[PDB]
Amino acid sequence: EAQRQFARVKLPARIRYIGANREGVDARLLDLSAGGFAFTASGAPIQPGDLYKGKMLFQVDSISFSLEVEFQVRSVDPASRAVGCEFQNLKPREVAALRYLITSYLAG
Amino acid sequence: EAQRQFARVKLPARIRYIGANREGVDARLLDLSAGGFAFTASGAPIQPGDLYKGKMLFQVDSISFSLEVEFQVRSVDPASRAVGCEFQNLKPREVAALRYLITSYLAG
Numbered sequence A, B: 001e002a003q004r005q006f007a008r009v010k011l012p013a014r015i016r017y018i019g020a021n022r023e024g025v026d027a028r029l030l031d032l033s034a035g036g037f038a039f040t041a042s043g044a045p046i047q048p049g050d051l052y053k054g055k056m057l058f059q060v061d062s063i064s065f066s067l068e069v070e071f072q073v074r075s076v077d078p079a080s081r082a083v084g085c086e087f088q089n090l091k092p093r094e095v096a097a098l099r100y101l102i103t104s105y106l107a108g
């Protein structure tokens, strides 16, 4: 089957996005990679295939990092309700920043 | 004489700090390294040796990055009024983030 191209890590990050019902959602990430992320479903029902826009926020020590993102929902786990999402249209510098963030956590 | 330990780059960054007269200062950086930065003097007079606290802000693409910092003024150029500053008490993760930021610009 398909191969994982980007390592996934747990870290202190959140996604803020506008849901299907036009209500804001502020969800903590289950994990992050340079390709996408996962979070637990809440708010309006979430259907794989749907496109969203939001802001990924990371904070540690005295660092705040935010990235505007677009994402597609790829899957929802029918037990845990983990929503697996794929970033769309990241710029090369954005991918590289995410990779730095990820690898710095993996390394630690 | 003393040796430069950290490479310096120009990038889109600013420092926001509270000046000697208790007034906010928002200055664009002349350059940045993992050790410190430079900006052009403005506001209250700035005397080498003095300690300040502030927030270093970086923005590019859809990325916003901010770091709380402490710094000591090391020098003021008597012609250009460039204020050369040294970060104090950075945590290892903060130094590593700055280094990533710097090297990514040098590389480009």
Ligand SMILES: Nc1nc2c(ncn2[C@@H]2O[C@@H]3COP(=O)(O)O[C@H]4[C@@H](O)[C@H](n5cnc6c(=O)[nH]c(N)nc65)O[C@@H]4COP(=O)(O)O[C@H]3[C@H]2O)c(=O)[nH]1
Binding pocket: A001, A002, A003, A004, A005, A006, A008, A009, A031, A032, A033, A034, A035, A036, A037, A038, A074, A075, A083, A084, A085, A086, A087
């Ligand atoms: N951080 C994170 N990102 C997510 C998650 N779900 C989806 N993504 C992102 O969306 C891309 C596509 O996911 P996919 O449709 O599940 O498509 C996946 C899936 O079919 C498969 N795959 C990846 N990891 C595994 C695995 O551990 N086992 C199996 N059997 N398949 C995997 O390879 C495809 C490509 O994987 P990636 O390169 O990682 O590319 C992923 C990844 O960037 C998630 O829960 N967390």
Ligand SMILES: Nc1nc2c(ncn2[C@@H]2O[C@@H]3COP(=O)(O)O[C@H]4[C@@H](O)[C@H](n5cnc6c(=O)[nH]c(N)nc65)O[C@@H]4COP(=O)(O)O[C@H]3[C@H]2O)c(=O)[nH]1
Binding pocket: B001, B002, B003, B004, B005, B006, B008, B009, B031, B032, B033, B034, B035, B036, B037, B038, B074, B075, B083, B084, B085, B086, B087
């Ligand atoms: N980005 C930036 N950071 C600044 C600036 N001024 C001071 N800093 C920071 O403050 C530290 C000490 O600066 P210094 O007292 O001038 O002390 C300096 C200075 O005495 C000397 N030095 C550094 N670069 C040069 C150079 O190109 N020529 C000469 N002659 N001396 C240099 O080596 C010492 C250590 O340098 P660093 O390791 O870089 O360590 C620097 C650096 O982290 C600045 O204009 N921009």
Ligand SMILES: [Cl-]
Binding pocket: A006, A007, A008
């Ligand atoms: Cl992995």
Ligand SMILES: [Cl-]
Binding pocket: B006, B007, B008
């Ligand atoms: Cl240099």
